[PDB]
């Protein structure tokens, strides 16, 4: 019952009133899907979308936090953000040289792409992929992580969504990231590959053709169980393909490593290695 008044304050020409309202709204939206629905129902979306045109970085940042938090809701709540017309203005911020704005725009986009296939396709259709793929070359590890989240989310969809990621040229950069000494960035690259390889055989074969298998097989020898798990999930997904895909996995030397991992003390590792080994007969 205070929400409608907060939403009206988003138009106040008093920047203190505006910012107080915006900070309250963003944080109510962080409190679960019912609180998100209350913010939507109070009419916040059109005002928040208008704020994506603001040249005031303080307003824009908090507007982005609010939209990100709404987009942490259910798929139809995400769709409300898309229907309010946010995506072009949001995607355009991936050109920003302001790292705070870029980071916050990426979170918002990544959350939208965590929706269902209609929500993901909207992000693709808004033109985000070339930018996201270029940010895989960023020397800023925060930005790089966030781009990998967004891309992983996009690649969590169906085969058409996956294929748009592949067609944007993500695979060579993802495979290059497999040699990173940054264990955080490595695992995010493996997540992206392990979503792409959960597609159909054409998507799996793209992962193979980009040269992922030698690096994944090397990573089966990692002493870091977090890395090993992620590499095993990726390789197991590839092994779920057709006989051409299975053969490529065998040719890369995976069988001998997987046989070794069958008795691993970590149960999650052992189970996925067993499952992978069975897929390959």
């Amino acid at each position: 019952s205070e929400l409608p008044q907060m939403v009206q304050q988003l138009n106040s020409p008093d920047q203190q009133e505006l910012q107080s309202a915006l900070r309250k709204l963003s944080q109510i939206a962080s409190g679960g899907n019912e609180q998100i629905q209350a913010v939507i129902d109070a009419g916040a979306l059109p005002a928040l979308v208008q704020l994506l045109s603001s040249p005031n970085e303080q307003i824009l940042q908090e507007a982005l936090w609010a939209l990100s938090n709404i987009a942490s809701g259910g798929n139809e709540q995400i769709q409300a953000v898309i229907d309010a017309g946010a995506l072009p203005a949001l995607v355009q911020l991936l050109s920003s040289p302001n790292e705070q704005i870029l980071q916050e725009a990426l979170w918002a986009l990544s959350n939208i792409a965590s929706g269902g296939n209609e929500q993901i396709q909207a992000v693709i259709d808004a033109g985000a992929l070339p930018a996201l793929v270029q940010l895989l070359s960023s020397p800023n590890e925060q930005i790089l992580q966030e781009a990998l989240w967004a891309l992983s989310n996009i690649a969590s969809g169906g085969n058409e969504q996956i294929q748009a990621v592949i067609d944007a040229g993500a695979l060579p950069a993802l495979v290059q990231l497999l040699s990173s000494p940054n264990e955080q960035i490595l695992q995010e690259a493996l997540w992206a590959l392990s979503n792409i390889a959960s597609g159909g055989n054409e998507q799996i074969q793209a992962v193979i053709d980009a040269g992922a298998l030698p690096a994944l097989v090397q990573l089966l020898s990692s002493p870091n169980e977090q890395i090993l798990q992620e590499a095993l999930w990726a390789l197991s997904n590839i092994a779920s393909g057709g006989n051409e895909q299975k053969q490529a996995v065998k040719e890369a030397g995976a069988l001998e490593k997987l046989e070794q991992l069958q008795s691993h003390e970590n149960e999650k590792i052992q189970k996925e290695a067993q499952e992978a080994l069975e897929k390959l007969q």
Partner: peptide, 10 residues
Amino acid sequence: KRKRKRKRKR
């Protein structure tokens, strides 16, 4: 098929 969300909280 693995999705993730990030909230922005103070």
